Write an enzyme that holds these catalytic residues in place. Structure first.
Site, PDB file in Angstrom:
ATOM      1  N   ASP A   1       0.830  -1.201   0.000  1.00 28.95           N
ATOM      2  CA  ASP A   1       0.000   0.000   0.000  1.00 28.95           C
ATOM      3  C   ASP A   1       0.870   1.260   0.000  1.00 28.95           C
ATOM      4  O   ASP A   1       1.966   1.260  -0.583  1.00 28.95           O
ATOM      5  CB  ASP A   1      -0.954  -0.066   1.205  1.00 28.95           C
TER       6      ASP A   1
ATOM      7  N   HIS B   1      -3.721   6.013   3.805  1.00 34.12           N
ATOM      8  CA  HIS B   1      -4.488   4.851   3.363  1.00 34.12           C
ATOM      9  C   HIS B   1      -3.883   3.546   3.877  1.00 34.12           C
ATOM     10  O   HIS B   1      -4.591   2.703   4.443  1.00 34.12           O
ATOM     11  CB  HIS B   1      -4.559   4.894   1.837  1.00 34.12           C
TER      12      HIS B   1
ATOM     13  N   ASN C   1     -14.118  -0.174  -6.433  1.00 36.55           N
ATOM     14  CA  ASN C   1     -15.142   0.769  -5.990  1.00 36.55           C
ATOM     15  C   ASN C   1     -15.910   1.386  -7.154  1.00 36.55           C
ATOM     16  O   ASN C   1     -16.307   2.550  -7.107  1.00 36.55           O
ATOM     17  CB  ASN C   1     -14.536   1.872  -5.124  1.00 36.55           C
TER      18      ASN C   1
ATOM     19  N   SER D   1     -11.175  -1.126  -0.082  1.00 36.63           N
ATOM     20  CA  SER D   1      -9.884  -1.082   0.598  1.00 36.63           C
ATOM     21  C   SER D   1     -10.000  -1.347   2.092  1.00 36.63           C
ATOM     22  O   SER D   1      -9.021  -1.772   2.710  1.00 36.63           O
ATOM     23  CB  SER D   1      -9.239   0.291   0.433  1.00 36.63           C
TER      24      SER D   1
END
Length: 279
Positions: free
Chosen positions: A39, A69, A161, A224
């Site tokens: 990530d 994130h 998404n 996520s």
């Protein structure tokens, strides 16, 4: 063990019903397992990680998470308050820049890195990788995720998404990894969650409280956020001896809460991650 006033998603993964707020889990808590968070990095100094997080690789000028994130996702895997597997070891691999973006070639290198790097780590109960990222279909990206899984790592990837079929996104569309959709606190499919035959499981993904950079916390939404619930669950179940890296996605699907989500399109699994813990 019981954690009162837990984030709704933790309570959800240990419950046969929505609408409760206590998380129940075996005290082993993922001890002896390892989860790689591939990530934007992890703020390992966050008190919530208790020294159990570390950065092991970056492809950029810093290993620090300048975005948040990756720290949020790592918190859902394994932070003391916000995490599923509260005693796992967390390893950060920074394949995304501080804007959250990254080239597929770097992401592929990061996956092949984890497949090798686990041989430099102590993970007697097994190894998981959490990939809360993706883009358009790429056979090379899917193949890298397949290699990582084949090497003995439980790979959990975000479905995406786009409120669309995940077949058109990578690594979401790789059949051999665990592709994770998102649900909300009322057991609805999250409005943005991708769907389709390639999904293996849903996890909590709308309004998920976790760690953030600057030693802080916040609630955000996405597939996520659902992915690290599943990655942490896998680590927890592997520590318990109930499954292995190769079998964990199937085991999670076998033991999931079934048929409880709304607005699941015909042909997408109606399965919600569940630890089946009986206090």
């Amino acid at each position: 063990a019981a954690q009162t006033n837990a984030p709704w998603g933790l309570a959800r993964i240990s419950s046969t019903s929505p609408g409760t707020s206590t998380y129940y889990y075996d005290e082993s808590a993922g001890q002896g397992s390892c989860v790689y968070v591939i990530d934007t990095g992890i703020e390992a100094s966050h008190p919530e990680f208790e020294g159990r997080a570390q950065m092991v690789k970056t492809y950029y000028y810093s290993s620090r998470d300048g975005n948040g994130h990756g720290t949020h996702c790592a918190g859902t895997v394994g932070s003391r308050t916000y995490g599923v597997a509260k005693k796992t070891q967390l390893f950060g691999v920074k394949v995304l820049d501080d804007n959250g973006s990254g080239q597929y070639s770097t992401i592929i290198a990061g996956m092949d890195f984890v497949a090798s790097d686990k041989n430099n780590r102590n993970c007697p109960k097994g190894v998981v990788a959490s990939l809360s990222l993706g883009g358009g279909y790429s056979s090379s990206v899917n193949s890298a995720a397949a290699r990582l899984q084949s090497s003995g790592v439980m790979v959990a990837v975000a479905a995406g998404n786009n409120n669309a079929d995940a077949r058109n996104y990578s690594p979401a569309s790789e059949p051999s990894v665990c592709t994770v959709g998102a649900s909300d606190r009322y057991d609805r499919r999250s409005s943005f969650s991708n769907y389709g035959s390639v999904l293996d499981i849903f996890g909590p993904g709308t309004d998920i409280l976790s760690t953030w950079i600057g030693g802080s916390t916040r609630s955000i939404s996405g597939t996520s956020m659902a992915t690290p619930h599943v990655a942490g669950l896998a680590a927890y179940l592997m520590t318990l001896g109930k499954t292995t890296a190769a079998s964990a996605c199937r085991y999670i699907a076998d033991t999931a809460n079934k048929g409880d989500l709304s607005n699941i399109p015909f042909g997408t699994v109606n399965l919600l991650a569940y630890n089946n813990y009986q206090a």
